[PDB]
UniProtKB/Swiss-Prot annotation, chains A, B, C, D, E, F, G:
Binding site for Fe(3+) A: 18, 51, 54
Name this polypeptide is given: Bacterial ferritin
GO cellular component: cytosol
Subcellular location: Cytoplasm
Residue numbers binding Fe(3+) D: 47, 50, 129
Binding site for Fe(3+) E: 50, 129
Recorded family membership: Belongs to the bacterioferritin family.
Keyword Oxidoreductase: yes
Length: 154, 154, 154, 154, 154, 154, 154
């Protein structure tokens, strides 16, 4: 079934963004492990798998709609310290959140309700799981201090 | 069996107080979880269930005594930080403690010994479980500092 | 992430309504049990738990959106006989249904699609589970008579 | 193997009748459930599955005999109340019974003994299971009254 | 709860379409089995069950909304060869897809968000399961030839 | 119990025909295995066992009726290639089908209803299992070509 | 421990190549599934996981050696048909093979024997698993024809 060219293009924009999110969590999780923070490694490794699934859902939907997926990831922007890395992932998730919301609006306008639902599932993941967890870590650092927070992530 | 109107009225006062305790633990537990303190969430979520059972015991006893339960909760007074929330719950439990003790005295005076025993069970919970645990947390903050205490509640 | 103030306010209106639904089922279920209708007790006790979960979902979403939840329940309006209690719960659910539908429209307008989905889940529960079951009981009373219906709920 | 054109045509008449029986039980069972009579729902849902199997046996036999099955169901005639629905299903089963008996006679005449046996299996189901159960329900309503009968089907 | 007459009417249009889809898969699956293609039989038998569930969801929703379901299936249009049957089912699913999308738009307009969600679930099934699988089979025939494809479906 | 001499004689005719069917499947199944088509071997080996049981039922019935069974099999007519062997077994089953139908008519005429039922069971096996499967194989060869069909039977 | 800058740079070149291999298998596997070749989907999905592990081993080794991993994947070059996709993956694996062999030589020269061993493990995977399997598929297409080969991958 041929999708609407505007929806396919916009799914392709989301796809290169999810491929990038996957890669930024790839490097941050391994950096965390390199420093001995295994709890941060585990969480961001898990989030890398989750972004791979988000990318996979977009890719498959684009193929079903007879589009050609764009496989070049967006640039990533890794941090160099634990607070910079948390902030960099939160900025990325906020960008994804905004992009998914605009995508849902576009899908509704072009009456592509299944693509809309696929983006809504990812939006809920972005807001209630990925971004929220990051806001919490930054909040924890603010409440107990960075040293105590890092101790808790060994 | 018709209870004494003074006992029924006083059980109704305790009931609106327990409905309020339930609700104050509802909001504090979720605030704790919002900030990433899952151990505080778990404990206050558990205490919300316990106040619901205390409310339930009062409600059922009022119905057995052919009274009409008053279902409007007392106002709650949530805190805005972990130490304010602990202090606010301790103040509420101290109020409940005093109210239950006065109720036991009233039940004894009106020779309603089963209602007295129901309040005694709740009084033991209030003093030895709910209030004591709160005093302990505040004591811990005083002994290791707030930052260390918060770290321990992640 | 800061939610839209209009959405947060409206979620807060829904929250005080769910806290009230929870409490009206609290008292009706116990009244049913007081009279010996254990099947009505079981169903409304189950519905009290369900409204507590609906309230919980709203409360958590409001906190995620950086709002302050309003914990005062709306007034309840319990019945005094089995048909009045069924009618009173149906009137409450119809009110909730209308309020949730208006909320979904508001969330769509402010492009808060995750809050919309949370309300849609609750709307489906309200229409297809809570309100429908009540309409059925009233329908049963109409078809076999109140005496037979009450016999069936022992 | 080419069947006798008269037998194939007559199997096709039975087939559109079974497709209709399936559909009339589809709607009646769901109407019963809509009203809260789950025991009537369960029985007629089960009978819908049974008519689907009766239809399936006829359809497959028609294909084996190199005919073309007629898939348009006969008109159905649902009732609007429990006694009308029982009467409407009994009238349909009595019609099926008569049609199957005439079919068995036709198959015997054209020496199609396997098609005869397939109709005999369905005739036994129609008389001893479907129609009999309906006659029993109507008999029960007559003996204990409609209100008591409906109570028993919740 | 009385639904909007325009939504009820449109659900009734979808219902007669699902009853038809169920019946077209009924006959095609049995034709496939008659020819010895058991893998096609299994898949279309499974899809017949799925359309029966789609019909059932619509029927129940119409009853909940106090409408009267229309139980006459749309005409079906079975093929006479494996490629015609695949094409005929794909044409039917494309028609259903378009009809469901228009229905979702109508439900949104009349603020019937639960009926909208029921259609969205069916739309996802239609696009991502039923229609996609058909497009794949036709694609396979194009890539390996009809003879090889038929061999693979024994 | 002495059977009718005409029925006994006719059962004896069917018996020598079943002994022959058993033997023709004996040789064809082993020829299929000799060539490496193990799926054809398995099916015709299974059908040899089934004809042995059909023969056994006739033999025992003849003895019960105090007749003397005729144990000389009819001549068989094996094919020399897979399509000739399928055609030769289909011709044999069509002959058996016709002979069983005439036998059922004869049994009905002589009011030997148990012998009739024994032949009806075998007739259903002949039409719906043995002959149908053969027609299907020949149909498959016609649809995918003989080479592909043979590949599928390895 | 600081690695040799020339080795770190060369590991970084291999890393962007493995990230690309991972992505080319990502898209090809999903394209294969889109067309209904589930065996090709399964194999290339498995190879995507394997390249992710190869990338992960390089990334971690670069961090251990105190380098900064380069996370931008090389360009990929997906095919548009099954033979083009197989050829495109074989060309990529041949490039990886050559790059790994040059890397092993470089590591030996700089006496980084553990990095050498990590590349040797990946080289064995590339030659004996990934590239060999691709050569086999192309060989199969050449021996039985593309149509038969595609049939075998459903
Ligand atoms: Fe997760
Ligand atoms: Fe997660
Ligand atoms: Fe994502
Ligand atoms: Fe998640
Ligand atoms: Fe994310
Ligand atoms: Fe406890
Ligand atoms: Fe406790
Ligand atoms: Fe208490
Ligand atoms: Fe306790
Ligand atoms: Fe307490
Ligand atoms: Fe429930
Ligand atoms: Fe419920
Ligand atoms: Fe609710
Ligand atoms: Fe529910
Ligand atoms: Fe509710
Ligand atoms: Fe049955
Ligand atoms: Fe039955
Ligand atoms: Fe029937
Ligand atoms: Fe039956
Ligand atoms: Fe029937
Ligand atoms: Fe399925
Ligand atoms: Fe399916
Ligand atoms: Fe459907
Ligand atoms: Fe499906
Ligand atoms: Fe469908
Ligand atoms: Fe068998
Ligand atoms: Fe057999
Ligand atoms: Fe036989
Ligand atoms: Fe058999
Ligand atoms: Fe036979
Ligand atoms: Fe492997
Ligand atoms: Fe491998
Ligand atoms: Fe590799
Ligand atoms: Fe490998
Ligand atoms: Fe490789
Ligand atoms: Na082949």
């Amino acid at each position: 079934m041929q999708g609407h060219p505007e929806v396919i293009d916009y799914l392709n924009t989301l796809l290169t963004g999810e491929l990038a999110a996957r890669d930024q969590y790839f490097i941050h999780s391994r950096m965390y492990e390199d420093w001995g923070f295994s709890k941060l490694y585990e969480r961001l490794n898990h989030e890398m798998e989750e972004e791979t699934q988000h990318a996979d859902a977009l890719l498959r939907r684009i193929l079903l709609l007879e589009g050609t997926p764009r496989m070049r990831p967006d640039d990533i922007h890794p941090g160099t310290t634990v607070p910079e890395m948390l902030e960099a992932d939160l900025k990325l998730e906020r960008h994804v959140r905004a992009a998914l919301a605009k995508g849902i609006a576009l899908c509704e306008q072009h009456k592509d309700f299944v693509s809309r639902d696929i983006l809504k599932a990812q939006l809920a993941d972005t807001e209630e799981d990925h971004a929220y967890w990051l806001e919490q870590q930054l909040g924890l650092i603010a409440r107990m201090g960075l040293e105590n927070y890092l101790q808790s992530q060994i």
